[PDB]
Amino acid sequence: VLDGPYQPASFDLPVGNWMLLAPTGPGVVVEGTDNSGRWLSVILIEPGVTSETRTYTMFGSSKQVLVSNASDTKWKFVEMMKTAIDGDYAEWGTLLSDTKLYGMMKYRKRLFIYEGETPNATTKRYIVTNYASVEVRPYSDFYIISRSQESACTEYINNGL
Amino acid sequence: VLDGPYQPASFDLPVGNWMLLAPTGPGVVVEGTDNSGRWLSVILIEPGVTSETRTYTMFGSSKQVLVSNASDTKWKFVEMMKTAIDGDYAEWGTLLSDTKLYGMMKYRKRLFIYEGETPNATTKRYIVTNYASVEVRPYSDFYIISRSQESACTEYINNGL
């Protein structure tokens, strides 16, 4: 019997700071949870994928997801969210991106990410419980940008490093 | 000036255990170092990649590597090794794989990995300093298989889960 699998550790990301992740390939990019009602696993899909089922381990649980990215040029981030510790995941939002950069921030009782389509990506907020203790698990290398420099973060998200 | 790159969390891999990583996409798979003379960054290349330069962040620094994978079916793991903290990386070994599973173990003054070509992949040992404190940094979820069950790890590496 194969126990687990196990996961890289999560990071108690300080509030008011953007984590700017730079994944290079498809798969799970980052996971975030308030340990109460929101568990978010962000997956990345390369260009030119017509409908197929892929397997991901989300918070250590192996799940099959039917994925699609018809764009020939943009990569596609997909927010997979469950709302109970044992619950099923569903797609809650997406980011279509030429830059392959993803952002996550804990701020003012909310978890913030970017959604939409570069170069016009815009932020999305989720109300969470005990937001300062939200755990963020990066599967990618990342940079940290203060919220005071959010205009710079928006520029990287939309136009690249 | 960007604050980073930061990396996924290092993992305290107990001696005498195979970390069996399950990456889903191209990019860095795992990094291992004795902080003395060996810094190993394992990169994964998808099938059907003609010679091209890709950027990876290796031990927290951006690096360009010329990569290729002529196989149309097998994924290719590449061991990029430097021997000084300042040094350049070179390819030291490879694993061609239909399973996309990669193993790493700290054992008997050595760092062990698999090399070759599935379904006949075989282990390789690197002498390292202070092997029990070698730092291991996973970029995906992973299983843990004791060395006493290495026959099972060999089966998974070569034939899948």
PDB file of all heavy atoms in Angstrom, chain A residues 2-3 5-9 24-27 57 138-139 141-144 156 161, chain B residues 2-9 24-27 57 139-144 161:
ATOM      1  N   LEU A   2       0.552   2.205  -0.879  1.00  0.00           N
ATOM      2  CA  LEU A   2       1.279   3.470  -0.980  1.00  0.00           C
ATOM      3  C   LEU A   2       0.562   4.519  -0.133  1.00  0.00           C
ATOM      4  O   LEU A   2      -0.515   4.997  -0.506  1.00  0.00           O
ATOM      5  CB  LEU A   2       1.385   3.926  -2.434  1.00  0.00           C
ATOM      6  CG  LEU A   2       2.569   3.385  -3.234  1.00  0.00           C
ATOM      7  CD1 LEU A   2       2.764   4.192  -4.495  1.00  0.00           C
ATOM      8  CD2 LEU A   2       3.841   3.396  -2.398  1.00  0.00           C
ATOM      9  N   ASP A   3       1.170   4.879   0.997  1.00  0.00           N
ATOM     10  CA  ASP A   3       0.619   5.904   1.872  1.00  0.00           C
ATOM     11  C   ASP A   3       0.674   7.269   1.191  1.00  0.00           C
ATOM     12  O   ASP A   3       1.592   7.567   0.425  1.00  0.00           O
ATOM     13  CB  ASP A   3       1.415   5.973   3.181  1.00  0.00           C
ATOM     14  CG  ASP A   3       1.802   4.598   3.729  1.00  0.00           C
ATOM     15  OD1 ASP A   3       0.906   3.882   4.209  1.00  0.00           O
ATOM     16  OD2 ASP A   3       3.010   4.241   3.698  1.00  0.00           O
ATOM     17  N   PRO A   5      -0.188  10.423  -1.232  1.00  0.00           N
ATOM     18  CA  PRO A   5       1.176  10.962  -1.127  1.00  0.00           C
ATOM     19  C   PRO A   5       1.339  12.108  -0.140  1.00  0.00           C
ATOM     20  O   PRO A   5       0.359  12.662   0.377  1.00  0.00           O
ATOM     21  CB  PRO A   5       1.462  11.463  -2.546  1.00  0.00           C
ATOM     22  CG  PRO A   5       0.104  11.883  -3.056  1.00  0.00           C
ATOM     23  CD  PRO A   5      -0.848  10.856  -2.478  1.00  0.00           C
ATOM     24  N   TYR A   6       2.594  12.455   0.106  1.00  0.00           N
ATOM     25  CA  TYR A   6       2.948  13.581   0.952  1.00  0.00           C
ATOM     26  C   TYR A   6       3.109  14.827   0.093  1.00  0.00           C
ATOM     27  O   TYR A   6       3.235  14.746  -1.131  1.00  0.00           O
ATOM     28  CB  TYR A   6       4.233  13.273   1.718  1.00  0.00           C
ATOM     29  CG  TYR A   6       4.142  11.958   2.465  1.00  0.00           C
ATOM     30  CD1 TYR A   6       4.610  10.777   1.894  1.00  0.00           C
ATOM     31  CD2 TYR A   6       3.529  11.888   3.714  1.00  0.00           C
ATOM     32  CE1 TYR A   6       4.504   9.566   2.572  1.00  0.00           C
ATOM     33  CE2 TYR A   6       3.425  10.688   4.398  1.00  0.00           C
ATOM     34  CZ  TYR A   6       3.911   9.533   3.821  1.00  0.00           C
ATOM     35  OH  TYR A   6       3.813   8.339   4.498  1.00  0.00           O
ATOM     36  N   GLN A   7       3.092  15.986   0.747  1.00  0.00           N
ATOM     37  CA  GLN A   7       3.122  17.255   0.038  1.00  0.00           C
ATOM     38  C   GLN A   7       4.242  18.141   0.554  1.00  0.00           C
ATOM     39  O   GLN A   7       4.562  18.108   1.747  1.00  0.00           O
ATOM     40  CB  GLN A   7       1.798  18.017   0.209  1.00  0.00           C
ATOM     41  CG  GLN A   7       0.548  17.253  -0.160  1.00  0.00           C
ATOM     42  CD  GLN A   7      -0.677  18.058   0.212  1.00  0.00           C
ATOM     43  OE1 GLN A   7      -0.997  19.054  -0.437  1.00  0.00           O
ATOM     44  NE2 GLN A   7      -1.350  17.655   1.290  1.00  0.00           N
ATOM     45  N   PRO A   8       4.823  18.978  -0.308  1.00  0.00           N
ATOM     46  CA  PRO A   8       5.694  20.045   0.196  1.00  0.00           C
ATOM     47  C   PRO A   8       4.929  20.905   1.187  1.00  0.00           C
ATOM     48  O   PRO A   8       3.708  21.037   1.106  1.00  0.00           O
ATOM     49  CB  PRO A   8       6.060  20.846  -1.062  1.00  0.00           C
ATOM     50  CG  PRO A   8       5.750  19.903  -2.236  1.00  0.00           C
ATOM     51  CD  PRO A   8       4.566  19.102  -1.752  1.00  0.00           C
ATOM     52  N   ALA A   9       5.659  21.487   2.132  1.00  0.00           N
ATOM     53  CA  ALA A   9       5.017  22.252   3.196  1.00  0.00           C
ATOM     54  C   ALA A   9       4.370  23.534   2.675  1.00  0.00           C
ATOM     55  O   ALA A   9       4.787  24.106   1.662  1.00  0.00           O
ATOM     56  CB  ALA A   9       6.029  22.610   4.286  1.00  0.00           C
ATOM     57  N   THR A  24       6.699  26.746 -14.629  1.00  0.00           N
ATOM     58  CA  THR A  24       7.185  26.526 -15.986  1.00  0.00           C
ATOM     59  C   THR A  24       6.373  25.506 -16.768  1.00  0.00           C
ATOM     60  O   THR A  24       6.453  25.502 -18.003  1.00  0.00           O
ATOM     61  CB  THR A  24       8.656  26.082 -15.973  1.00  0.00           C
ATOM     62  OG1 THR A  24       8.757  24.815 -15.321  1.00  0.00           O
ATOM     63  CG2 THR A  24       9.519  27.098 -15.234  1.00  0.00           C
ATOM     64  N   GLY A  25       5.614  24.640 -16.101  1.00  0.00           N
ATOM     65  CA  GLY A  25       4.868  23.608 -16.782  1.00  0.00           C
ATOM     66  C   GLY A  25       3.501  23.341 -16.183  1.00  0.00           C
ATOM     67  O   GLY A  25       3.176  23.793 -15.082  1.00  0.00           O
ATOM     68  N   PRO A  26       2.680  22.577 -16.898  1.00  0.00           N
ATOM     69  CA  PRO A  26       1.328  22.286 -16.409  1.00  0.00           C
ATOM     70  C   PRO A  26       1.365  21.449 -15.140  1.00  0.00           C
ATOM     71  O   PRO A  26       2.311  20.693 -14.893  1.00  0.00           O
ATOM     72  CB  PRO A  26       0.684  21.509 -17.564  1.00  0.00           C
ATOM     73  CG  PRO A  26       1.841  21.014 -18.393  1.00  0.00           C
ATOM     74  CD  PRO A  26       2.942  21.993 -18.226  1.00  0.00           C
ATOM     75  N   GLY A  27       0.311  21.591 -14.336  1.00  0.00           N
ATOM     76  CA  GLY A  27       0.147  20.905 -13.070  1.00  0.00           C
ATOM     77  C   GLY A  27      -0.307  21.867 -11.992  1.00  0.00           C
ATOM     78  O   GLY A  27      -0.654  23.022 -12.257  1.00  0.00           O
ATOM     79  N   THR A  57      -3.164  15.650  -7.782  1.00  0.00           N
ATOM     80  CA  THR A  57      -3.368  15.504  -6.347  1.00  0.00           C
ATOM     81  C   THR A  57      -3.574  16.900  -5.776  1.00  0.00           C
ATOM     82  O   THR A  57      -2.691  17.761  -5.871  1.00  0.00           O
ATOM     83  CB  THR A  57      -2.231  14.758  -5.634  1.00  0.00           C
ATOM     84  OG1 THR A  57      -0.952  15.232  -6.060  1.00  0.00           O
ATOM     85  CG2 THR A  57      -2.336  13.268  -5.931  1.00  0.00           C
ATOM     86  N   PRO A 138       3.223  26.656  -2.137  1.00  0.00           N
ATOM     87  CA  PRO A 138       3.729  26.856  -3.499  1.00  0.00           C
ATOM     88  C   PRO A 138       4.334  25.565  -4.035  1.00  0.00           C
ATOM     89  O   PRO A 138       5.095  24.882  -3.338  1.00  0.00           O
ATOM     90  CB  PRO A 138       4.798  27.943  -3.326  1.00  0.00           C
ATOM     91  CG  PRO A 138       5.317  27.714  -1.919  1.00  0.00           C
ATOM     92  CD  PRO A 138       4.107  27.254  -1.116  1.00  0.00           C
ATOM     93  N   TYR A 139       3.989  25.235  -5.281  1.00  0.00           N
ATOM     94  CA  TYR A 139       4.646  24.167  -6.028  1.00  0.00           C
ATOM     95  C   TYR A 139       5.580  24.732  -7.087  1.00  0.00           C
ATOM     96  O   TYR A 139       6.129  23.978  -7.900  1.00  0.00           O
ATOM     97  CB  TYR A 139       3.608  23.254  -6.679  1.00  0.00           C
ATOM     98  CG  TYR A 139       2.903  22.333  -5.703  1.00  0.00           C
ATOM     99  CD1 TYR A 139       1.789  22.765  -4.987  1.00  0.00           C
ATOM    100  CD2 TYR A 139       3.350  21.028  -5.515  1.00  0.00           C
ATOM    101  CE1 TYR A 139       1.136  21.912  -4.097  1.00  0.00           C
ATOM    102  CE2 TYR A 139       2.714  20.169  -4.635  1.00  0.00           C
ATOM    103  CZ  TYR A 139       1.611  20.610  -3.931  1.00  0.00           C
ATOM    104  OH  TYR A 139       0.982  19.748  -3.057  1.00  0.00           O
ATOM    105  N   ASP A 141       8.554  28.136  -7.917  1.00  0.00           N
ATOM    106  CA  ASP A 141       9.313  29.245  -7.356  1.00  0.00           C
ATOM    107  C   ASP A 141       8.466  30.517  -7.418  1.00  0.00           C
ATOM    108  O   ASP A 141       7.513  30.613  -8.197  1.00  0.00           O
ATOM    109  CB  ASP A 141      10.643  29.423  -8.101  1.00  0.00           C
ATOM    110  CG  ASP A 141      11.695  28.363  -7.696  1.00  0.00           C
ATOM    111  OD1 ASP A 141      11.382  27.433  -6.932  1.00  0.00           O
ATOM    112  OD2 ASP A 141      12.871  28.484  -8.095  1.00  0.00           O
ATOM    113  N   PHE A 142       8.780  31.483  -6.550  1.00  0.00           N
ATOM    114  CA  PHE A 142       7.934  32.671  -6.468  1.00  0.00           C
ATOM    115  C   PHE A 142       8.710  33.874  -5.958  1.00  0.00           C
ATOM    116  O   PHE A 142       9.783  33.753  -5.363  1.00  0.00           O
ATOM    117  CB  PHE A 142       6.704  32.442  -5.563  1.00  0.00           C
ATOM    118  CG  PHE A 142       7.046  32.136  -4.126  1.00  0.00           C
ATOM    119  CD1 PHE A 142       7.069  33.145  -3.172  1.00  0.00           C
ATOM    120  CD2 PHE A 142       7.343  30.838  -3.735  1.00  0.00           C
ATOM    121  CE1 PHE A 142       7.378  32.868  -1.841  1.00  0.00           C
ATOM    122  CE2 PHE A 142       7.652  30.546  -2.408  1.00  0.00           C
ATOM    123  CZ  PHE A 142       7.670  31.572  -1.456  1.00  0.00           C
ATOM    124  N   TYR A 143       8.137  35.053  -6.197  1.00  0.00           N
ATOM    125  CA  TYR A 143       8.637  36.308  -5.655  1.00  0.00           C
ATOM    126  C   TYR A 143       7.613  36.860  -4.676  1.00  0.00           C
ATOM    127  O   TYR A 143       6.452  36.436  -4.652  1.00  0.00           O
ATOM    128  CB  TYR A 143       8.909  37.326  -6.775  1.00  0.00           C
ATOM    129  CG  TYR A 143       9.846  36.783  -7.825  1.00  0.00           C
ATOM    130  CD1 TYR A 143       9.363  35.982  -8.858  1.00  0.00           C
ATOM    131  CD2 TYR A 143      11.212  37.032  -7.762  1.00  0.00           C
ATOM    132  CE1 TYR A 143      10.214  35.459  -9.815  1.00  0.00           C
ATOM    133  CE2 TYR A 143      12.075  36.506  -8.714  1.00  0.00           C
ATOM    134  CZ  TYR A 143      11.561  35.718  -9.736  1.00  0.00           C
ATOM    135  OH  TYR A 143      12.387  35.188 -10.698  1.00  0.00           O
ATOM    136  N   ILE A 144       8.051  37.797  -3.837  1.00  0.00           N
ATOM    137  CA  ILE A 144       7.158  38.437  -2.880  1.00  0.00           C
ATOM    138  C   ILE A 144       7.161  39.932  -3.158  1.00  0.00           C
ATOM    139  O   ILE A 144       8.224  40.569  -3.153  1.00  0.00           O
ATOM    140  CB  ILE A 144       7.551  38.139  -1.426  1.00  0.00           C
ATOM    141  CG1 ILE A 144       7.499  36.630  -1.159  1.00  0.00           C
ATOM    142  CG2 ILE A 144       6.604  38.877  -0.463  1.00  0.00           C
ATOM    143  CD1 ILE A 144       8.158  36.214   0.170  1.00  0.00           C
ATOM    144  N   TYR A 156       3.576  42.839 -13.826  1.00  0.00           N
ATOM    145  CA  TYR A 156       4.217  41.547 -14.078  1.00  0.00           C
ATOM    146  C   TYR A 156       3.195  40.494 -14.492  1.00  0.00           C
ATOM    147  O   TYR A 156       3.413  39.742 -15.456  1.00  0.00           O
ATOM    148  CB  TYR A 156       4.974  41.071 -12.834  1.00  0.00           C
ATOM    149  CG  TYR A 156       6.140  41.941 -12.418  1.00  0.00           C
ATOM    150  CD1 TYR A 156       6.280  42.352 -11.102  1.00  0.00           C
ATOM    151  CD2 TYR A 156       7.102  42.334 -13.336  1.00  0.00           C
ATOM    152  CE1 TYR A 156       7.346  43.143 -10.705  1.00  0.00           C
ATOM    153  CE2 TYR A 156       8.177  43.123 -12.949  1.00  0.00           C
ATOM    154  CZ  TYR A 156       8.289  43.524 -11.632  1.00  0.00           C
ATOM    155  OH  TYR A 156       9.349  44.307 -11.238  1.00  0.00           O
ATOM    156  N   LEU A 161       7.964  39.305 -16.542  1.00  0.00           N
ATOM    157  CA  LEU A 161       9.151  39.750 -15.825  1.00  0.00           C
ATOM    158  C   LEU A 161      10.105  40.517 -16.736  1.00  0.00           C
ATOM    159  O   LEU A 161      10.836  41.401 -16.290  1.00  0.00           O
ATOM    160  CB  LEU A 161       9.874  38.549 -15.208  1.00  0.00           C
ATOM    161  CG  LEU A 161       9.068  37.721 -14.209  1.00  0.00           C
ATOM    162  CD1 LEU A 161       9.860  36.510 -13.725  1.00  0.00           C
ATOM    163  CD2 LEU A 161       8.631  38.584 -13.037  1.00  0.00           C
TER     164      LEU A 161
ATOM    165  N   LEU B   2      13.100  42.605  -7.634  1.00  0.00           N
ATOM    166  CA  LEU B   2      12.160  41.606  -7.140  1.00  0.00           C
ATOM    167  C   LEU B   2      12.748  40.838  -5.966  1.00  0.00           C
ATOM    168  O   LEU B   2      13.913  40.428  -5.988  1.00  0.00           O
ATOM    169  CB  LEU B   2      11.779  40.637  -8.256  1.00  0.00           C
ATOM    170  CG  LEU B   2      10.595  41.056  -9.120  1.00  0.00           C
ATOM    171  CD1 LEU B   2      10.447  40.084 -10.274  1.00  0.00           C
ATOM    172  CD2 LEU B   2       9.324  41.113  -8.294  1.00  0.00           C
ATOM    173  N   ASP B   3      11.922  40.632  -4.941  1.00  0.00           N
ATOM    174  CA  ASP B   3      12.307  39.863  -3.761  1.00  0.00           C
ATOM    175  C   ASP B   3      12.068  38.389  -4.066  1.00  0.00           C
ATOM    176  O   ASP B   3      10.936  37.905  -4.008  1.00  0.00           O
ATOM    177  CB  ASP B   3      11.510  40.329  -2.546  1.00  0.00           C
ATOM    178  CG  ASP B   3      11.945  39.651  -1.249  1.00  0.00           C
ATOM    179  OD1 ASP B   3      12.925  38.882  -1.251  1.00  0.00           O
ATOM    180  OD2 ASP B   3      11.291  39.897  -0.220  1.00  0.00           O
ATOM    181  N   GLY B   4      13.144  37.670  -4.388  1.00  0.00           N
ATOM    182  CA  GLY B   4      13.066  36.282  -4.785  1.00  0.00           C
ATOM    183  C   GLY B   4      14.115  35.979  -5.840  1.00  0.00           C
ATOM    184  O   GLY B   4      14.969  36.816  -6.137  1.00  0.00           O
ATOM    185  N   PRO B   5      14.057  34.788  -6.455  1.00  0.00           N
ATOM    186  CA  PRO B   5      13.012  33.781  -6.254  1.00  0.00           C
ATOM    187  C   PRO B   5      13.189  32.952  -4.992  1.00  0.00           C
ATOM    188  O   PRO B   5      14.290  32.522  -4.636  1.00  0.00           O
ATOM    189  CB  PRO B   5      13.138  32.885  -7.491  1.00  0.00           C
ATOM    190  CG  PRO B   5      14.542  33.006  -7.902  1.00  0.00           C
ATOM    191  CD  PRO B   5      14.984  34.407  -7.535  1.00  0.00           C
ATOM    192  N   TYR B   6      12.072  32.765  -4.312  1.00  0.00           N
ATOM    193  CA  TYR B   6      11.928  31.776  -3.261  1.00  0.00           C
ATOM    194  C   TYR B   6      11.449  30.474  -3.882  1.00  0.00           C
ATOM    195  O   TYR B   6      10.961  30.446  -5.007  1.00  0.00           O
ATOM    196  CB  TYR B   6      10.936  32.272  -2.208  1.00  0.00           C
ATOM    197  CG  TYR B   6      11.411  33.502  -1.474  1.00  0.00           C
ATOM    198  CD1 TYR B   6      10.990  34.777  -1.849  1.00  0.00           C
ATOM    199  CD2 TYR B   6      12.281  33.386  -0.402  1.00  0.00           C
ATOM    200  CE1 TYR B   6      11.434  35.912  -1.163  1.00  0.00           C
ATOM    201  CE2 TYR B   6      12.729  34.506   0.284  1.00  0.00           C
ATOM    202  CZ  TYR B   6      12.303  35.754  -0.102  1.00  0.00           C
ATOM    203  OH  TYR B   6      12.753  36.844   0.588  1.00  0.00           O
ATOM    204  N   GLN B   7      11.586  29.384  -3.143  1.00  0.00           N
ATOM    205  CA  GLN B   7      11.342  28.064  -3.693  1.00  0.00           C
ATOM    206  C   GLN B   7      10.364  27.294  -2.817  1.00  0.00           C
ATOM    207  O   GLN B   7      10.133  27.668  -1.661  1.00  0.00           O
ATOM    208  CB  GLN B   7      12.667  27.292  -3.801  1.00  0.00           C
ATOM    209  CG  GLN B   7      13.694  27.964  -4.713  1.00  0.00           C
ATOM    210  CD  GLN B   7      15.044  27.282  -4.625  1.00  0.00           C
ATOM    211  OE1 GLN B   7      15.264  26.258  -5.260  1.00  0.00           O
ATOM    212  NE2 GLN B   7      15.935  27.828  -3.808  1.00  0.00           N
ATOM    213  N   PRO B   8       9.773  26.202  -3.340  1.00  0.00           N
ATOM    214  CA  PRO B   8       8.985  25.320  -2.476  1.00  0.00           C
ATOM    215  C   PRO B   8       9.794  24.844  -1.285  1.00  0.00           C
ATOM    216  O   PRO B   8      11.031  24.842  -1.314  1.00  0.00           O
ATOM    217  CB  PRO B   8       8.599  24.164  -3.408  1.00  0.00           C
ATOM    218  CG  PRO B   8       8.621  24.795  -4.801  1.00  0.00           C
ATOM    219  CD  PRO B   8       9.804  25.717  -4.732  1.00  0.00           C
ATOM    220  N   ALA B   9       9.096  24.444  -0.231  1.00  0.00           N
ATOM    221  CA  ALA B   9       9.748  24.132   1.037  1.00  0.00           C
ATOM    222  C   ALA B   9      10.602  22.867   0.956  1.00  0.00           C
ATOM    223  O   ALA B   9      10.193  21.848   0.384  1.00  0.00           O
ATOM    224  CB  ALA B   9       8.689  23.971   2.126  1.00  0.00           C
ATOM    225  N   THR B  24       3.832  16.150 -12.888  1.00  0.00           N
ATOM    226  CA  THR B  24       2.890  16.053 -13.999  1.00  0.00           C
ATOM    227  C   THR B  24       3.317  16.837 -15.230  1.00  0.00           C
ATOM    228  O   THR B  24       2.758  16.609 -16.308  1.00  0.00           O
ATOM    229  CB  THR B  24       1.497  16.543 -13.572  1.00  0.00           C
ATOM    230  OG1 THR B  24       1.576  17.922 -13.201  1.00  0.00           O
ATOM    231  CG2 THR B  24       0.971  15.724 -12.406  1.00  0.00           C
ATOM    232  N   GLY B  25       4.269  17.748 -15.102  1.00  0.00           N
ATOM    233  CA  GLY B  25       4.654  18.594 -16.207  1.00  0.00           C
ATOM    234  C   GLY B  25       6.128  18.932 -16.190  1.00  0.00           C
ATOM    235  O   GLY B  25       6.826  18.733 -15.190  1.00  0.00           O
ATOM    236  N   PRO B  26       6.622  19.479 -17.297  1.00  0.00           N
ATOM    237  CA  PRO B  26       8.046  19.827 -17.388  1.00  0.00           C
ATOM    238  C   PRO B  26       8.441  20.923 -16.413  1.00  0.00           C
ATOM    239  O   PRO B  26       7.651  21.808 -16.073  1.00  0.00           O
ATOM    240  CB  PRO B  26       8.201  20.304 -18.837  1.00  0.00           C
ATOM    241  CG  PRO B  26       6.811  20.769 -19.220  1.00  0.00           C
ATOM    242  CD  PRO B  26       5.872  19.851 -18.511  1.00  0.00           C
ATOM    243  N   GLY B  27       9.683  20.853 -15.963  1.00  0.00           N
ATOM    244  CA  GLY B  27      10.264  21.830 -15.072  1.00  0.00           C
ATOM    245  C   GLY B  27      11.104  21.134 -14.021  1.00  0.00           C
ATOM    246  O   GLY B  27      11.345  19.929 -14.092  1.00  0.00           O
ATOM    247  N   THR B  57      14.739  28.142 -12.550  1.00  0.00           N
ATOM    248  CA  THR B  57      15.339  28.664 -11.335  1.00  0.00           C
ATOM    249  C   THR B  57      15.911  27.459 -10.589  1.00  0.00           C
ATOM    250  O   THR B  57      15.176  26.542 -10.204  1.00  0.00           O
ATOM    251  CB  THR B  57      14.345  29.489 -10.511  1.00  0.00           C
ATOM    252  OG1 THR B  57      13.051  28.876 -10.527  1.00  0.00           O
ATOM    253  CG2 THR B  57      14.212  30.887 -11.120  1.00  0.00           C
ATOM    254  N   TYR B 139       9.383  19.490  -5.783  1.00  0.00           N
ATOM    255  CA  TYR B 139       8.515  20.400  -6.526  1.00  0.00           C
ATOM    256  C   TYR B 139       7.172  19.770  -6.875  1.00  0.00           C
ATOM    257  O   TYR B 139       6.426  20.325  -7.688  1.00  0.00           O
ATOM    258  CB  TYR B 139       9.208  20.878  -7.804  1.00  0.00           C
ATOM    259  CG  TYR B 139      10.135  22.042  -7.572  1.00  0.00           C
ATOM    260  CD1 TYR B 139      11.330  21.874  -6.874  1.00  0.00           C
ATOM    261  CD2 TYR B 139       9.817  23.313  -8.039  1.00  0.00           C
ATOM    262  CE1 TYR B 139      12.181  22.945  -6.655  1.00  0.00           C
ATOM    263  CE2 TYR B 139      10.660  24.374  -7.830  1.00  0.00           C
ATOM    264  CZ  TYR B 139      11.834  24.186  -7.140  1.00  0.00           C
ATOM    265  OH  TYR B 139      12.662  25.260  -6.926  1.00  0.00           O
ATOM    266  N   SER B 140       6.859  18.616  -6.300  1.00  0.00           N
ATOM    267  CA  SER B 140       5.562  17.990  -6.495  1.00  0.00           C
ATOM    268  C   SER B 140       5.290  17.130  -5.278  1.00  0.00           C
ATOM    269  O   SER B 140       6.153  16.964  -4.414  1.00  0.00           O
ATOM    270  CB  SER B 140       5.524  17.152  -7.771  1.00  0.00           C
ATOM    271  OG  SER B 140       6.305  15.975  -7.600  1.00  0.00           O
ATOM    272  N   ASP B 141       4.086  16.568  -5.220  1.00  0.00           N
ATOM    273  CA  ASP B 141       3.806  15.560  -4.207  1.00  0.00           C
ATOM    274  C   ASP B 141       4.630  14.301  -4.469  1.00  0.00           C
ATOM    275  O   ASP B 141       5.144  14.078  -5.572  1.00  0.00           O
ATOM    276  CB  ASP B 141       2.314  15.207  -4.180  1.00  0.00           C
ATOM    277  CG  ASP B 141       1.447  16.376  -3.725  1.00  0.00           C
ATOM    278  OD1 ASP B 141       2.009  17.373  -3.218  1.00  0.00           O
ATOM    279  OD2 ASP B 141       0.205  16.292  -3.870  1.00  0.00           O
ATOM    280  N   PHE B 142       4.741  13.461  -3.441  1.00  0.00           N
ATOM    281  CA  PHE B 142       5.666  12.333  -3.515  1.00  0.00           C
ATOM    282  C   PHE B 142       5.239  11.265  -2.519  1.00  0.00           C
ATOM    283  O   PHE B 142       4.579  11.546  -1.514  1.00  0.00           O
ATOM    284  CB  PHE B 142       7.107  12.791  -3.226  1.00  0.00           C
ATOM    285  CG  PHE B 142       7.237  13.517  -1.921  1.00  0.00           C
ATOM    286  CD1 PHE B 142       7.498  12.820  -0.747  1.00  0.00           C
ATOM    287  CD2 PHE B 142       7.067  14.899  -1.863  1.00  0.00           C
ATOM    288  CE1 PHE B 142       7.594  13.484   0.468  1.00  0.00           C
ATOM    289  CE2 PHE B 142       7.156  15.572  -0.644  1.00  0.00           C
ATOM    290  CZ  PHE B 142       7.422  14.855   0.523  1.00  0.00           C
ATOM    291  N   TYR B 143       5.649  10.033  -2.799  1.00  0.00           N
ATOM    292  CA  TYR B 143       5.501   8.925  -1.868  1.00  0.00           C
ATOM    293  C   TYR B 143       6.821   8.684  -1.137  1.00  0.00           C
ATOM    294  O   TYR B 143       7.874   9.210  -1.510  1.00  0.00           O
ATOM    295  CB  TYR B 143       5.038   7.672  -2.618  1.00  0.00           C
ATOM    296  CG  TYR B 143       3.760   7.913  -3.396  1.00  0.00           C
ATOM    297  CD1 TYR B 143       3.799   8.346  -4.720  1.00  0.00           C
ATOM    298  CD2 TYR B 143       2.515   7.731  -2.798  1.00  0.00           C
ATOM    299  CE1 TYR B 143       2.620   8.578  -5.434  1.00  0.00           C
ATOM    300  CE2 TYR B 143       1.343   7.947  -3.500  1.00  0.00           C
ATOM    301  CZ  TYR B 143       1.402   8.371  -4.814  1.00  0.00           C
ATOM    302  OH  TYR B 143       0.238   8.604  -5.511  1.00  0.00           O
ATOM    303  N   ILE B 144       6.758   7.876  -0.077  1.00  0.00           N
ATOM    304  CA  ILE B 144       7.942   7.523   0.705  1.00  0.00           C
ATOM    305  C   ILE B 144       7.952   6.011   0.862  1.00  0.00           C
ATOM    306  O   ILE B 144       7.004   5.436   1.413  1.00  0.00           O
ATOM    307  CB  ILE B 144       7.966   8.208   2.084  1.00  0.00           C
ATOM    308  CG1 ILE B 144       8.122   9.739   1.953  1.00  0.00           C
ATOM    309  CG2 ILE B 144       9.096   7.631   2.943  1.00  0.00           C
ATOM    310  CD1 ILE B 144       9.520  10.215   1.520  1.00  0.00           C
ATOM    311  N   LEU B 161       2.270   3.360 -11.121  1.00  0.00           N
ATOM    312  CA  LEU B 161       1.541   3.117  -9.879  1.00  0.00           C
ATOM    313  C   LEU B 161       0.361   2.173 -10.089  1.00  0.00           C
ATOM    314  O   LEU B 161      -0.201   1.637  -9.133  1.00  0.00           O
ATOM    315  CB  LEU B 161       1.043   4.435  -9.282  1.00  0.00           C
ATOM    316  CG  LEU B 161       2.092   5.517  -9.028  1.00  0.00           C
ATOM    317  CD1 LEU B 161       1.432   6.809  -8.548  1.00  0.00           C
ATOM    318  CD2 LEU B 161       3.121   5.026  -8.027  1.00  0.00           C
TER     319      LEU B 161
END
